[PDB]
Design a protein around this motif. Structure first.
Motif, PDB file in Angstrom:
ATOM      1  N   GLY A 116       6.813  -0.365  -2.319  1.00  0.00           N
ATOM      2  CA  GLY A 116       6.079   0.199  -1.203  1.00  0.00           C
ATOM      3  C   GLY A 116       5.132  -0.769  -0.520  1.00  0.00           C
ATOM      4  N   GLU A 117       4.020  -0.248  -0.007  1.00  0.00           N
ATOM      5  CA  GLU A 117       3.060  -1.070   0.720  1.00  0.00           C
ATOM      6  C   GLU A 117       2.287  -1.965  -0.249  1.00  0.00           C
ATOM      7  OE1 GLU A 117       1.413  -1.571   3.821  1.00  0.00           O
ATOM      8  OE2 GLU A 117      -0.178  -2.674   2.786  1.00  0.00           O
ATOM      9  N   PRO A 118       2.105  -3.252   0.082  1.00  0.00           N
ATOM     10  CA  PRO A 118       1.387  -4.157  -0.838  1.00  0.00           C
ATOM     11  C   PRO A 118      -0.032  -3.721  -1.166  1.00  0.00           C
ATOM     12  CG  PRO A 118       2.573  -5.407   0.827  1.00  0.00           C
ATOM     13  CD  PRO A 118       2.683  -3.969   1.231  1.00  0.00           C
ATOM     14  N   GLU A 119      -0.766  -3.179  -0.189  1.00  0.00           N
ATOM     15  CA  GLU A 119      -2.095  -2.649  -0.477  1.00  0.00           C
ATOM     16  C   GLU A 119      -2.011  -1.455  -1.418  1.00  0.00           C
ATOM     17  OE1 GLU A 119      -3.846   0.307   0.576  1.00  0.00           O
ATOM     18  OE2 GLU A 119      -5.706  -0.403  -0.347  1.00  0.00           O
ATOM     19  N   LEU A 120      -1.011  -0.593  -1.211  1.00  0.00           N
ATOM     20  CA  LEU A 120      -0.814   0.553  -2.092  1.00  0.00           C
ATOM     21  C   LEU A 120      -0.521   0.105  -3.517  1.00  0.00           C
ATOM     22  CD1 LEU A 120      -0.541   3.783  -1.688  1.00  0.00           C
ATOM     23  CD2 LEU A 120      -1.064   2.379   0.321  1.00  0.00           C
ATOM     24  N   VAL A 121       0.350  -0.893  -3.678  1.00  0.00           N
ATOM     25  CA  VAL A 121       0.684  -1.393  -5.008  1.00  0.00           C
ATOM     26  C   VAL A 121      -0.525  -2.050  -5.662  1.00  0.00           C
ATOM     27  CG1 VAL A 121       2.263  -2.851  -6.310  1.00  0.00           C
ATOM     28  CG2 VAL A 121       3.071  -1.655  -4.294  1.00  0.00           C
ATOM     29  N   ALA A 122      -1.307  -2.810  -4.889  1.00  0.00           N
ATOM     30  CA  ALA A 122      -2.479  -3.477  -5.451  1.00  0.00           C
ATOM     31  C   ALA A 122      -3.519  -2.466  -5.922  1.00  0.00           C
ATOM     32  CB  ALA A 122      -3.081  -4.431  -4.419  1.00  0.00           C
ATOM     33  N   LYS A 123      -3.823  -1.471  -5.082  1.00  0.00           N
ATOM     34  CA  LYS A 123      -4.782  -0.438  -5.466  1.00  0.00           C
ATOM     35  C   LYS A 123      -4.269   0.383  -6.643  1.00  0.00           C
ATOM     36  CE  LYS A 123      -5.174   2.672  -2.423  1.00  0.00           C
ATOM     37  NZ  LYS A 123      -4.108   3.490  -3.065  1.00  0.00           N
ATOM     38  N   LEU A 124      -2.968   0.688  -6.649  1.00  0.00           N
ATOM     39  CA  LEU A 124      -2.371   1.457  -7.734  1.00  0.00           C
ATOM     40  C   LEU A 124      -2.456   0.707  -9.057  1.00  0.00           C
ATOM     41  CD1 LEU A 124      -0.989   3.629  -5.717  1.00  0.00           C
ATOM     42  CD2 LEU A 124       1.070   3.180  -7.019  1.00  0.00           C
ATOM     43  N   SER A 125      -2.165  -0.596  -9.042  1.00  0.00           N
ATOM     44  CA  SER A 125      -2.246  -1.391 -10.265  1.00  0.00           C
ATOM     45  C   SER A 125      -3.688  -1.546 -10.728  1.00  0.00           C
ATOM     46  CB  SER A 125      -1.600  -2.759 -10.045  1.00  0.00           C
ATOM     47  OG  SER A 125      -1.079  -3.277 -11.257  1.00  0.00           O
ATOM     48  N   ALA A 126      -4.624  -1.693  -9.786  1.00  0.00           N
ATOM     49  CA  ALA A 126      -6.035  -1.767 -10.152  1.00  0.00           C
ATOM     50  C   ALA A 126      -6.505  -0.468 -10.796  1.00  0.00           C
ATOM     51  CB  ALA A 126      -6.880  -2.094  -8.921  1.00  0.00           C
ATOM     52  N   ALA A 127      -6.044   0.673 -10.277  1.00  0.00           N
ATOM     53  CA  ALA A 127      -6.372   1.954 -10.892  1.00  0.00           C
ATOM     54  C   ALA A 127      -5.719   2.095 -12.262  1.00  0.00           C
ATOM     55  CB  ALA A 127      -5.948   3.100  -9.976  1.00  0.00           C
TER      56      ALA A 127
END
Ligand code: ZN
Lengths: 349, 371, 165, 266
Positions: A116-127
């Motif tokens: 998906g969206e790179p920002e979405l993946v980054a925030k998801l992995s950080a969470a």
RNA sequence: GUGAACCGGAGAAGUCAUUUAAUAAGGCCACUGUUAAAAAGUAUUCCCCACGCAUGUGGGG
């Protein structure tokens, strides 16, 4: 090239991703992690409630593309489950017992790729690095045995190369591996092939809400991968079945060769039993041998008394402890062994 | 309040308990095979002992019509009694019903009284019969072991609805595992013919199975549930506790005892007063081997003492201290030659142990409570 | 396993006097009858000095006593379960076979410290049928790792394979 | 942050959890068949305990369940070794003599002995938000659950087998991502003459903890754990660069240490 | 916060009763541990400390 997809390792002793066809006291399961289940796992990891999930988070995250690779199929295991035994049940109330039969997956592992969206993946992995709530595998009695935040994100093109990226991790050395790994992936139209093939099957796991739970169907296809060509077999970490330490043995060692000299100095070069001039030293308290030698438990001895003590230790039992001189006990048997050694041992040997 | 008894008992070669194939009963504990004696065997052998005879006030029988006839004398009421027993949901298969019934022996006279008179009708009498079997719970053996009875439903009289016919157990008995490995042995026996013939052969040839082991016995008694089971009869409850201790110490199961006669006494008894039950069966997760410097019973007692010390030091609570007594005949076997501190009192006489137990329980004396 | 080979070869090299000394010590400890202790120490100690591996002391003592009582020519390919299965196959299949099989299956339950008599009855049954060989090296190697489950599995499987054919 | 309790408990031969046929409940792991205790059985036996209730918006409603979502989490009690079920052949007796030596009833019951591995999880944030900012009562109910779970057992068939054992190893850890250590016993524990069933299980747990400490758990955040055995009966990883931060020999000391970490309350 | 959350299959029980592995037996036969030897020895005793022309006495190991 920023990463664009997130990888989930879903592996536990017991797993249960429930299917749409339960609807009753027969709580069934699906063979693979459903999209709504992993979406609820993500929302629980991000601290979003059921009411708050239905407004923006689920429509935002429903646009991702998901594919699951099978590492271990598992075995479907059932469980007899009674509710309200010895206690009343809701609806007024009634003194009755409710019977049910639940289904779990045992010894199974799945890899989930969510592009998906790179920002979405980054925030998801950080969470997912520090989840807000406890994340389980379907039911609350199914905690994961491996960290979900294990495999790093990356940038790829198709789902097949994404599932090819992560190697297959092996258990104990004897264990064989599956030869054909099924992948279950979402069907992609591409805006040219507007009509799906006839092998595409409908699953009912597209969520909207959670408190009034609502799902919609989706077209899902199933392909396969070949291990070695597509996924390289990873090697197990350094591990073994725990065995009690059998210690070691080494006299040539110079440290013991000097510890014995310290002992012969400290007991003034004399035997403890017969007070003859010392010859060697008996190694009482055999624990910590070779590397942690303390010149305290050792006791200097002559050849006859040492041979007698070795005779007593060879007979009867033998463990990490030894037979210690200066004990008021064992004196009579040591003297009897001294008598036998003196009157029976032949030097012609 | 709970009274828990742990016993170590080495037995002569015998076959006190065996399964359907004749082999002695075994089990897997700690990954190692140990010999076992079933808990129901110990419970029955204590219950039907001579030292418990003054307290046996209940019968678990299948033939109740036979007792009805034998207590009614000469007037013929056996078919009638069988009919009324069938009416309350018990069935009948050739003079013995399909289920065992647990009931105190004092109430057979009442059942005879209801079955004799023709003044009452049939079906209502059946209901009355139920009201006697649902209330025949004032027996020491029913109070100790516990009773549950669920009658049939496909042949009931529809007017014979039952009251609560269960009694919670006031005594928990474990399966007597062995402290060491299992060593099963085969005894090859023959049986000869007293009359000579042509050949030298004998009448029968076979093999039996036997084993010798040191067993760890565990019992637990709930004093509050015991005095509730007998409806506040503290005197009778203390009498049951004392007689149970005497019978448990001085009786062995009667399995193949005419050929082996393993009438061995326990070599150590530990009686503890607690609020929550603890089992010391994990003392022998590692099996007990033999060293020449000691013997099996002393090593087992030392292992038990070590584990008791571990349990007391790792689960000490200042809110509930535990008081225990250690008994060995003439203080032959102390609680290990390492601590001398886990036994609050050292007793060398069994009667003194029973008296001290009773005095801690309620301050009574033994000779007061024996009647 | 070269240390075990040297141990067995030294056992075959023994004369008759020390063989009788070992024969008189059946069922005994190691702490009495000093000539037995001296002979066993002479037999076993040089193995550890040169060879890094060496059989266990209890296993070596049991093997030496069994060899003294039941002198057999060491030959490769004559393991105990195979010979026991070959003996068991030529038996009455109703009464004698369960008894002898029970005596064999008693062995795979104990430790090294209690295998002497249950092994001596087996060697007596072997000597009854006039055997002339026994794999002492393989028996010693199996007895060394007697606590591993595949060892007992292969022992039983070899017995069944020799019994069936 | 999250609190996780790992538990090793050997049981004497009994039948602590049954099914529709009477057999002990089992599961599948490591390629073999293991004994099991269902999670709801453990949760019920912990919740309805009289000593637990007499000890301590309600604290049981805050910890357990009744949207009120519980912070408690009980996993199925897998076994660290291959299951060994057994049949006991029982015969009922009649006290009244008859024409023959009949029984009255004949049957078979089931029992099994196992060394179970238990996993627990307590979410501190959900617990403190369930009681509206209260912390001392949260620590009090955490300690109450610790004592109760350490000193309780299911009541299944305990009038006939009486498996009133006690745990032989407890490991309490604080970390963020929830991982259980059931992967330690993928290889079933096989006994040897130089160890026990509990000793080998504790050693394999130590080996797995050491391997995972050498791996994923980097220097991003330290992991604080406490190890307890009665009177220091069993060590988890002797020395081994201090795999366990503390070694405890009494339940009260572990409870106090965990409480003093979580809030410093006493 | 996942077709999820809240969620015991529980209560009762003795495999018992009967029995000799008995009858026959030899480890026997043949053997040299033999050959060579003084318990003697003065030219510096292995060490501490008081005096001396003695060409050493005294005490300690
Ligand atoms: Zn000496």
């Amino acid at each position: 090239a920023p990463p664009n997809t997130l990888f989930l390792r879903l592996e536990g002793a017991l797993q249960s991703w429930g299917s749409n066809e339960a609807k009753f006291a027969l709580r069934r399961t699906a063979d693979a992690p459903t999209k709504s289940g992993v979406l609820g796992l993500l929302c629980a990891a991000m601290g979003i409630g059921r009411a708050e999930a239905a407004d923006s988070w689920l429509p935002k995250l429903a646009n991702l593309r998901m594919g699951v690779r099978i590492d271990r199929p598992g075995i479907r295991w059932w469980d007899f489950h009674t509710v309200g035994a010895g206690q009343r049940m809701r609806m007024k109330t009634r003194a009755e017992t409710l019977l049910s039969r639940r289904e779990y997956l045992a010894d199974a592992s799945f890899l989930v790729a969510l592009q998906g969206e790179p920002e979405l993946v980054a925030k998801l992995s950080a969470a997912l690095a520090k989840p807000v709530w406890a994340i389980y595998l379907g039911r609350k009695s199914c905690p994961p045995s491996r960290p979900v935040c294990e495999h790093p994100p990356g940038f790829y093109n198709t789902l097949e190369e994404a599932l090819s990226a992560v190697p297959l991790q092996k258990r104990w050395h004897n264990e064989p591996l599956p030869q054909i790994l099924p992948c279950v992936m979402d069907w992609i139209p591409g805006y040219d092939g507007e009509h799906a093939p006839d092998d595409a099957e409908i699953h009912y796991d597209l969520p909207v809400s959670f408190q009034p739970p609502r799902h919609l169907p989706r077209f899902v296809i199933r392909r396969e991968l070949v291990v070695g060509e597509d996924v390289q077999v990873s090697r197990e970490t350094g591990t073994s079945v725990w065995r009690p330490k059998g210690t070691r043995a080494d006299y040539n060692n110079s440290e013991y060769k000097k510890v014995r000299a310290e002992r012969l100095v400290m007991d003034h070069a004399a035997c403890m039993v017969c007070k003859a001039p010392a010859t060697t030293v008996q190694h009482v308290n055999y624990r910590r041998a070779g590397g942690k030698e303390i010149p305290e438990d050792l006791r200097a001895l002559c050849r006859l008394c040492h041979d007698a003590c070795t005779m007593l230790e060879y007979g009867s039992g033998m463990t990490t402890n030894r037979i210690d001189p200066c004990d008021p006990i064992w004196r009579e048997r040591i003297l009897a062994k001294r008598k036998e050694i003196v009157e029976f041992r032949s030097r012609g040997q | 309040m709970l009274i828990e008894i742990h016993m170590i008992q080495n037995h002569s070669p015998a076959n006190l308990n065996r399964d359907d194939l004749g082999a002695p009963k075994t089990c897997y504990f700690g990954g190692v095979l140990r010999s076992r004696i079933s808990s129901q065997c110990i419970k029955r052998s204590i219950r039907t002992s001579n030292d418990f005879k003054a307290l046996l006030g209940g019968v678990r029988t299948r033939r109740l019509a036979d007792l009805i006839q034998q207590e009614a004398g000469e007037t013929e009421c056996w078919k009638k009694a069988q009919e009324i027993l069938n009416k309350c949901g018990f069935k009948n298969k050739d003079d013995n019903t399909k289920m065992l019934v647990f009931m105190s022996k004092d109430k057979i006279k009442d059942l005879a009284r209801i079955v004799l008179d023709n003044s009452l009708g049939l079906t209502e009498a059946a209901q009355q019969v139920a009201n006697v079997i649902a209330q025949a719970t004032l027996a020491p053996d029913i109070a100790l072991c516990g009773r549950m009875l669920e009658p049939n439903d496909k042949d009931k009289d529809k007017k014979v609805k039952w009251s609560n016919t269960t009694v919670e157990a006031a005594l928990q008995v474990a399966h007597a595992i062995s402290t060491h490995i299992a060593r099963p042995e085969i005894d090859y026996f023959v049986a000869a013919d007293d009359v000579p013939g042509e050949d030298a052969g004998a009448g029968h040839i076979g093999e039996s199975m036997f084993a010798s082991a040191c067993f760890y016995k565990y019992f637990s008694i709930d004093w509050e549930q015991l005095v509730k089971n007998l409806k506040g009869d503290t005197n009778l409850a203390a009498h049951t506790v004392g007689a149970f201790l005497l019978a448990a110490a001085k009786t062995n199961p009667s399995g193949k005892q005419n050929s082996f006669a393993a009438h061995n006494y326990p070599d150590g008894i530990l009686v503890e007063f607690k609020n929550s039950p603890i089992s010391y069966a994990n003392a022998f997760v590692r099996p007990v081997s033999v060293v020449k410097e000691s013997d099996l019973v002393e090593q087992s007692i030392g292992q038990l003492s070590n584990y008791v010390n571990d349990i007391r030091l790792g689960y000490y609570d200042e809110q509930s201290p535990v008081i225990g007594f250690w008994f060995s005949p003439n203080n032959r076997y102390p609680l290990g030659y390492k601590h001398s501190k886990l036994a609050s009192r050292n007793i060398g006489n069994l009667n003194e142990l029973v008296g001290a137990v009773l005095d801690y329980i309620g301050g009574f004396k033994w000779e007061e409570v024996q009647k | 396993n070269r240390g075990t080979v040297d141990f067995i070869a030294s056992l075959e090299n023994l004369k008759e006097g020390d063989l009788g000394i070992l024969r008189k010590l059946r069922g005994a400890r190691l702490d009495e009858k000093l000539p037995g202790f001296d002979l066993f120490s002479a037999l076993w100690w040089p193995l550890r000095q040169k060879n890094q591996r060496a059989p266990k002391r209890e296993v070596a003592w049991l093997i030496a006593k069994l060899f003294a009582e039941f002198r057999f020519e060491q030959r490769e390919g004559a393991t105990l379960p195979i010979l026991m299965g070959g003996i068991c196959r030529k038996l009455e299949p109703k009464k004698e076979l369960p008894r002898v099989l029970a005596r064999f299956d008693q062995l795979a339950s104990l430790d090294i410290m209690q295998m002497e008599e249950p092994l001596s009855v087996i060697m007596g049954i072997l000597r009854k049928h006039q055997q002339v060989c026994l794999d002492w090296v393989g028996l010693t190697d199996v007895l060394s790792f007697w606590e591993q489950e595949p060892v007992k599995r292969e022992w039983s499987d070899s017995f069944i394979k020799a019994y069936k054919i």
